[PDB]
């Protein structure tokens, strides 16, 4: 785990821009990568849940991975979410990530069909092999995957040879502490942005989050405040993040974020892919106001 | 619903054979199609959950659809499960099913990401358009999809223009009855094989099931028995189905079925795709014995 | 379990009438017992969920047990639900049921606090001992108890010395069949009225239900129809039961039932105990019409 | 809410000691009350889930309330958990709490039968009336109650006239923050001991907990450390609390706690009431060593 310590940080879960024909918008993808870099983000987690991985083909996911590396390789840390239900598909994406010079790969626990724990372990092992030396970030998100990993199961997964981190999108902060206690050196990303300050206090040492695309400096601010013992500032920042997250949950998170980025002149067309619909027009004034507030704040 | 009456019956949820390199085994696919036809099945439901849809590419799913139509079009009913999380991908499969001469299309409620009910409705409408005249079979499987659907939501879905049937993979037989009561003419497929007799009694007028690949005649026997008022034979047949299902659940259902079909000289290599593992070798004697029992019973 | 065979049948889960002050309405209880007897009911299940056991004191529950035995002992079968969270409290009620000359006792799996399976087992053993010869009816209602027993755990419970039946308030009709297959002689009561026909088909040999208080003859009609191979009549009766159940679920089931019984001149004051509120006035025309309908139909 | 500020703090959810015959062990109950006061606990939450309320009669619960008020009234804050499924039973216990001079009442959302949100509200209103001026602590524990309240529903409940606090036994720390943001003055007790530090950070201003009976000073220590900006001490203390909680979850929490207290000479017979069984003998060494560790630490 100590050999992956350079993966520690606050990493935006990159959104994948589309146009009105639902095609990849590669110009907006480049703009969003540069926007994140200019903001001072530590890294990008590419083609994850927030990236709409599960409504893209392997080819599309590869095209996005390739472009992000062109834009960002060597400037910030790059994690490729290569996870699919299929192991073989996941391996293809892992091999591509390696070719493009990503720093790490990542895979969600495969979903839909119930798999045995042993089947999960073998899935990670196979993807790790295809990653050809890129460390693996195990991605746990029980709310969407339906996969209910026990602590003992998590301990086994995060100690597989080649695993360097866990992205823990769980609100169970007892379990967060338990993981930190068992694995003192493990890179442990908090995945729910709306508990980030609490997740760090429980033992996370960074995070990966969708909302970091529009306000990642606030999460950096929380890490800094907690490091300095400035509890009030950490709380204030988390409160401001949660005010924003309340709105995004109302509007739909990915599309709300894309809409903010559109009003920030970053994303040309703020659409997610079908079956996501567009943002309800009634929310547009709040989203524009938020874009303006955040632009004023970031300066 | 009246117009889609011809879709009523007992339809096997077709397995997709693979080889040891995890490639499609097209020769075994043709053998399994013909094996199902010779059992006297009413039709096939192709590329569904049982067909390992979600570990195949669109191209692979299309190749399978095309072969099944070559082998079976005009001889038995053909329903193409075209569902993906992506609407656009689902539409491509629906257009392909139309080109190949399928009798109907079907789509699981899209999963992983939470979608609103309106979004689900639009997804079905879009697929129905691309199906270009083929009726839609709505596919409800809350246990795997994570989409619960209220009764009112089901009623709205099954009355969209172009919907001709519901595949109801739910053990809630109060809801089964409520659906029948609201929609007297709706084709209503019982989805859980281990309650088939009870599901018919509650109001299903047919079924779509994985285990029909190895013993579809038993399910047709339950239909006949209940039609004749012969309750004891219906129960006896369901009990025998359930003795089989108990075993299949222990071994893993799809791979156990493929293993039975291998011992029956239908499927060359009884593998599912990774991350499914192989059948535990400790179960092979029981599966071989089962294959021999069913071959003896069938003649 | 051939010793408990005489417990087989269709038994109403007796409601507990209260007066305007929410005290026991003894006169209405006596009238309701006689009303049930005159419908041709096989027995009464007293002080269960439907009897509002969990908002009564032990003394109150005993008073109800005593009165019902006075009114009904030797005329129909009498099952005392003695279950509490506390084992000792349950034993007190079991001892009382024995003194009053009940035919059997019953206990819900103790709830609120998680208990181990062994602890569940010891609870039933202790209550069985205090019942001093009265057979025990294990009562399984996962939806309310929160207790999620495996099939194996059910098998162990129903084979404890002194256990003569299982009241299975579960809509899992695979499990209903599994239980019947494992225990061919076990008295197995279907607990969800809205799947009664399907539950019998799966393996139940009777039922215990709240709605039997207002239309028990319909359930006896289903038993008769299925015995005679008359599937149509069984379905028609189940459908009619479910029309009523739809309404009762809208109104609140216990209070809706008590309101129907008020309009049938049995229950003086159709209130449940706080925190149950009154029936919404808007439902009274429907409940009155139902009362009139059922009275014209009769036993 | 701001008038109930006096209820803020760290309150032990008192255990109910029983004798070998499973009756109330009054001598051990008195010792446990005094033990808690000596640890510097802010108050006691009596006849809760931890007190094994739901395996006691109303009379038994009243006997406990009376004895605790005898032992503690005026020295520390006293909150009576009076909640039952029945509203009338809960009212009886609220009336008793008032007679015994408790500072507040509390009630778990009534369970087993599903009740409408309107019905929950009326249940609390009725209990508040019977408490006759004692503020109400709404008690939310979805994992045991099966009651899944929305944030809007919580907001309505905690703003009923007479409600002065929320005991929030939920691990959802987004919701904890939302509650604090909507109700800046509300007393908000963190209920899961194993996330206490994180719960305070999210917006709780105190806690009610079972493990406070054996190491309440540690929780007070977390409060102090966070107030001082001493994040490492707060984290260290939380880690130590969780090492203990890991063990108690293995042993069974209430019986494990009673066993630790037995080895501390507080509880004569460390049994919970049936259907709870005894602690597995295999855990006795660890529980005995924990008792020694904690006595040495205090």
Curated annotation (Swiss-Prot), chains A, B, C:
GO terms for biological process: carbohydrate metabolic process; N-acetylneuraminate catabolic process. It comes from the Bacteria. Transmembrane segments: none annotated. Pathway: Amino-sugar metabolism; N-acetylneuraminate degradation; D-fructose 6-phosphate from N-acetylneuraminate: step 1/5. Pfam families: DHDPS. It is found in: Cytoplasm. The active site is at 139 (proton donor), 167 (schiff-base intermediate with substrate). It is an enzyme of class 4 (lyase). Aceneuramate binds at residues 49-50, 169, 191, 193-194, 210. Keywords: Carbohydrate metabolism, Cytoplasm, Lyase, Schiff base. It catalyses: aceneuramate = aldehydo-N-acetyl-D-mannosamine + pyruvate. GO terms for cellular component: cytosol. Its EC number is 4.1.3.3. One of its GO terms (molecular function) is N-acetylneuraminate lyase activity. Catalyzes the reversible aldol cleavage of N-acetylneuraminic acid (sialic acid; Neu5Ac) to form pyruvate and N-acetylmannosamine (ManNAc) via a Schiff base intermediate. Homotetramer. HAMAP family: N_acetylneuram_lyase. Belongs to the DapA family. NanA subfamily. This is N-acetylneuraminate lyase. The gene is nanA.
